[PDB]
Amino acid sequence: TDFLTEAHLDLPMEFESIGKAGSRLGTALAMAVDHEINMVSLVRNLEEFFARESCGWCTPCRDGLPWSVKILRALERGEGQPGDIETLEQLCRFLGPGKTFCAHAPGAVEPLQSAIKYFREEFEAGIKQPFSNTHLINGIQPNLLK
């Protein structure tokens, strides 16, 4: 389920009330996160669980949850690069309902997108390194894209 802030604490535990707040009632067993817990590490743990519990049937969950896991691992260690949060948002958009074979992957990307929506300063703090995907090959001048 999507993370909610302290402002949403004054809301009745109904399906329609939590549905209009941008989350789900779910099993109605709420979990509280304090100020000590880093949101990036918590979302990394959640996505690690969700990626290793994929059944492997369909491409977006099976091949995109490990990408989000690796991005969150890099953000945890301060090895984040530009475009990582954009990749996480694209994964949120493209792992929604109707795009995967079952509802496991929309539930996987709900906490990631809610924590990005509410705690974006913690995810942006992990991006330190410049984006690098290639190494230099001697004798070939790279296409310097601007």
Which residues are near another protein by CB under 8 A?
Answer: 138-141
End-to-end alpha-carbon separation of the chain, Å?
39
Environment class of residue 73 by beta-carbon count within 10 Å: exposed (0-12), middle (13-18) or buried (19+)? middle
- Candidates 102, 125, 129, 131: give the one binding ligand SF4 (CB under 6 A): 102
- Closest by CA position to 67, among listed 82, 78, 49, 51: 51
Minimum CB separation of residue 131 from another protein in Å reads: 23
* From ligand SF4, another protein, none, interface partner of 134 (C-beta below 5 to 8 A by class): none
What Rg value do the Cα atoms of the chain yield, rounded?
A: 17
Is residue 108 packed enough to be buried (19+ CB in 10 Å), middle (13-18) or exposed (0-12)? Answer: buried
CB of 18 to ligand SF4, least distance (A): 23
**Cα 117 to chain centroid, rounded:** 10
Do 56 and 90 meet the contact criterion of CB atoms below 8 Å apart? no
Q: Which does 28 bind (CB under 5 to 8 A by kind): another protein, ligand SF4, none?
A: none
Residue choice 24, 73, 104, 117 for contact with ligand SF4 (CB under 6 A): 104
Q: Which partner in another protein, ligand SF4, none is near 145 (CB below 5 to 8 A by kind)?
A: none
Q: Which stretch binds ligand SF4 (CB under 6 A): 14-22, 25-33, 96-104, 114-122?
A: 96-104
140 binds, among another protein, ligand SF4, none (CB under 5 to 8 A by kind): another protein
List the helix and strand counts (H, then E) for the chain.
6, 0
Task: Report the residue number whose CB is nearest to ligand SF4.
Answer: 61
Contact between 61 and ligand SF4 per CB under 6 A: yes
